[PDB]
Structures are given as C-alpha cells and as structure tokens.
C-alpha cells in the first residue's frame, strides 16, 4: 500500500505503509525521511485527525490517498 503525504506548505510525497501497521509506524517513516517528530506533525483525512495508535484498515483509507500535514504550534 502507498499513500501521498501533503505538507501544508504544498508538497506531496510518496509513502509506502502496510494497512495493518498503525499510524505510529507511518509517522516513524515520515520522521526518517522528512525529519520531523511524530507528535509535532499531525495528519488529517476525512475530516478526522489520524491518531498515533490505530490501524489504517479501520480508517479504510483509499489507495494512494493524500494526507494533510499539520504541525502543532509551539506553546511558547
């Protein structure tokens, strides 16, 4: 399975992830490639933010779907 991550700025990137694998795994890959903490980055889809502890299967995400990237604003 493959999915494209779209950054708020405007950049889509291919990202292969097993349906069984939870979101946490996806964030891990994103961190290694892009270099951004999982907690910091937040994905959005179907009017719902993806939780870092749920299998993609439940979400029933379409093949090669685009995920909206949203970086949490610093508390300071």
């Amino acid at each position: 399975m493959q999915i494209f991550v779209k950054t708020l700025t405007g950049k889509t990137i291919t990202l292969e992830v097993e349906s069984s694998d939870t979101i946490d795994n996806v964030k891990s890959k994103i961190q290694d490639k892009e270099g951004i903490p999982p907690d910091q980055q937040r994905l959005i889809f179907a009017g719902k933010q993806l939780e870092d502890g749920r299998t993609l299967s439940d979400y029933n995400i379409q093949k090669e779907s685009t995920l909206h990237l949203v970086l949490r604003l610093r508390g300071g």
Partner: peptide
C-alpha cells in the same frame, strides 16, 4: 484569532472533505 494552528487544522479538514465527497 490567536489560534492559527487550530484554524489551520480545520482548514485542512474542509479541504480534504471536499475531495472525499464521494465517500472516498
């Protein structure tokens, strides 16, 4: 509003919903 992060999150929420109009 001093919550650019929150608005941004929903902004993306609406944008995505528009595309996934056909329940996908």
């Amino acid at each position: 509003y001093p919550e650019d992060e929150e608005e941004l999150i929903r902004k993306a929420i609406e944008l995505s919903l528009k595309e996934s109009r056909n329940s996908a």
